[PDB]
Amino acid sequence: LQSTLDNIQSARPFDELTVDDLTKIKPEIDAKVEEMVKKGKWDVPGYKDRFGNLNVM
């Protein structure tokens, strides 16, 4: 845990973050994306549940 805490502090993409970086460190990203395209639902709660969702309407 000491080591993991250090790993979060000295390397962390958060002042520049591309979906390529999250896809690269976690293929869980692409797995979930693919499952959602397969699901045929393009609403995912997780985008609007803390991250914004301003909309014209």
Binding site: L5, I8, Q9, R12, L17, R50, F51, G52, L54
Partner: protein, 52 residues
């Protein structure tokens, strides 16, 4: 005839750049900040979890 129309378009882009372009910059900025703050919040949160 159509040079009058092109003049109208030049005026149109002038008004757009006067009023809308700084407004859209500010709007975009505001959202960008919000996304960033949430993102950085999540980073803090997992740091807490390690300590917990």
């Amino acid at each position: 005839d159509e040079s009058i129309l092109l003049l109208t378009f030049l005026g149109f882009t002038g008004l757009v750049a006067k009023y809308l372009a700084p407004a859209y910059k500010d709007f975009a900025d505001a959202r960008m900040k919000k996304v960033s703050d949430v993102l950085n919040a999540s980073r803090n949160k997992h740091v807490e979890a390690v300590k917990d």
